[PDB]
Design a protein around this nucleic acid. Structure first.
Length: 268
DNA sequence: AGCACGCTGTGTATATAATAGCTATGGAACGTTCGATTCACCTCCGATGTGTGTTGTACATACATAAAAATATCATAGCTCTTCTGCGCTGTGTTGGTCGTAGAC
């Protein structure tokens, strides 16, 4: 939504039904900033999943404020379901969460009324006071299933080797350079699509062509050889013989290189 | 039902007249646009002229100070002649006694 900045005409009232002020009533919500490993971030950010269903439970043991995640069994079985939420900062300062929503376009002292401000709806989702990180638990039987998977991270290669053509080299070189095979592709056949347009015309008489030239000059005073030729469908030799009698080309004016009506016929 | 087979059309090549129409091409002119180059103005050091602080002077007064000199004041010697003091003398106040008397009670 591109829009002009520093608008003092209050045009945002008419074009934007939603208020431009920042919503702050959600800022009192507590938000835990959590850093996840590769698998939990992979399965907790995909758009084909996360339909609002429950993914786990949070257990906070108050003996030492130990936070654990007990994941549900609906996701997988090879992954662990018990995790430790370590807190690297019990109090996190100067960190908040803000969200942006698109607007509805339907229905010294020196200042400049143009700053190119993009208006977007903004709202503080809450306040962050806990920076969290989720580690897999040591005692889980599936914990090794993570570690080997991590050992699978450095082991697999994402690139494949080059492919070697194992057939006879003459069959491979049959298509190269000198070949009987004419090209059958239609990619950039500019000469095919431009040389097929041919104009054919006859020596149609002088009175009708001069009347046609007068009609085009009445429609617009300035014309060219190509536009008049495609408008009247006449040969260049016959069209030139009629233009110089009743019209002339401009040599020094702002509309130069264009055929225009003579000043004697201009007042007609 | 759809691809193999047969048939036909088209393009290849040869010459050769005809015509109109289309197109490539060289050149000349000119508008458009973009990069290169230079002007005016500002700034910043540098020369300059010019302006001002300092010193000294002139002209012709006023003005504060102050010193040599005439002079009023005074300190003091001289003098002189009027008073103070010591000595000589003497004469009258003093002491004692007697007796009238007079004034206090």
């Amino acid at each position: 939504e591109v829009f002009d900045g520093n608008d003092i005409e209050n045009n945002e009232t008419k074009v934007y039904e939603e208020s431009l002020d920042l919503d702050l009533e959600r800022s009192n919500r507590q938000v835990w900033l959590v850093r996840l490993p590769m698998f939990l971030a992979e399965k907790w950010r995909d758009r084909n999943n996360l339909h609002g269903q429950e993914l786990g439970k949070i257990r906070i043991n108050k003996d030492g404020s130990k936070i654990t995640l007990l994941l549900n069994e609906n996701d997988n079985d090879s992954i662990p379901h018990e995790y430790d939420l370590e807190l690297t900062k019990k109090v996190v300062e100067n960190e908040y969460v803000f969200t942006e929503q698109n607007l509805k376009k339907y229905q010294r002292d020196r200042y400049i009324p143009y700053v190119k401000t993009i208006p977007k709806k903004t709202a503080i989702v809450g306040t962050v006071c806990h920076e969290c990180q989720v580690m897999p638990s040591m005692n889980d039987p599936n914990y090794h299933k993570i570690v080997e998977q991590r050992r699978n991270i450095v082991k697999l290669n994402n690139k494949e080797r080059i492919t070697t053509l194992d057939e006879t080299v003459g069959v491979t070189m049959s298509h190269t350079g000198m070949s009987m095979r004419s090209d059958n592709s239609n990619f950039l056949k500019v000469g095919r699509e431009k040389a097929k347009s041919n104009i054919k015309s006859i020596r149609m008489p002088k009175k009708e062509i001069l009347d046609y030239l007068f009609k085009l000059f009445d429609e617009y005073d300035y014309w060219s050889l190509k536009g008049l030729k495609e408008r009247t469908r006449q040969p260049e030799a016959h069209l030139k013989e009629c233009l110089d009698k009743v019209a002339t080309l401009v040599k020094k004016g702002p509309y130069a290189f264009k055929y225009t009506l003579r000043p004697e016929y201009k007042k007609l």
